[PDB]
Design a protein around this ligand. Sequence first.
Ligand code: NA
Ligand code: NA
Ligand code: NA
Ligand code: NA
Ligand code: NA
Ligand code: NA
Ligand code: NA
Ligand code: NA
Ligand code: NA
Ligand code: NA
Ligand code: NA
Ligand code: NA
Ligand code: NA
Ligand code: NA
Ligand code: NA
Ligand code: NA
Ligand code: NA
Ligand code: NA
Ligand code: NA
Ligand code: NA
Ligand code: NA
Lengths: 8, 137
Amino acid sequence: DPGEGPST
Amino acid sequence: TSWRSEATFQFTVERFSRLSESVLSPPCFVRNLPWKIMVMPRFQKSVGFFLQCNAESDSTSWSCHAQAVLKIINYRDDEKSFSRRISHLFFHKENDWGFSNFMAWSEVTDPEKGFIDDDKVTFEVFVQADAPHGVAW
Ligand code: NA
Ligand code: NA
Ligand code: NA
Ligand code: NA
Ligand code: NA
Ligand code: NA
Ligand code: NA
Ligand code: NA
Ligand code: NA
Ligand code: NA
Ligand code: NA
Ligand code: NA
Ligand code: NA
Ligand code: NA
Ligand code: NA
Ligand code: NA
Ligand code: NA
Ligand code: NA
Ligand code: NA
Ligand code: NA
Ligand code: NA
């Protein structure tokens, strides 16, 4: 998956 | 004006193949708040691409919901540009949102793909933000 979420 | 409810802005990252630290674009004002593009390498490996909002402010009362389209421009054919969309409530504890694995690093840096030229890659954000709360009382 594209790893959606906060930069951390 | 800076009170506009939406805007599209770009940030061109130079010496891209050599990117090691997180890079931040100048601010674009929408709803009178500073929005920025954040790019970083993730695991060379993948392209980290996030949208940041009002991160410098020490305020803890603000919030702004927005939808956005994060796109990496393909200079050879814009129909080949790659984009993903997000929907997020930005506030002091969650001031940015995006994708740590937006695109494969090998693909964006592939000279035959059309995303990189002279080791430069252009990022674009189209943000549509709702009226903020806890800011302009
Ligand atoms: Na730029
Ligand atoms: Na910019
Ligand atoms: Na360059
Ligand atoms: Na800054
Ligand atoms: Na800008
Ligand atoms: Na900045
Ligand atoms: Na602006
Ligand atoms: Na700020
Ligand atoms: Na910001
Ligand atoms: Na803040
Ligand atoms: Na900032
Ligand atoms: Na800021
Ligand atoms: Na506050
Ligand atoms: Na708020
Ligand atoms: Na809002
Ligand atoms: Na809000
Ligand atoms: Na806040
Ligand atoms: Na941030
Ligand atoms: Na490319
Ligand atoms: Na580009
Ligand atoms: Na809007």
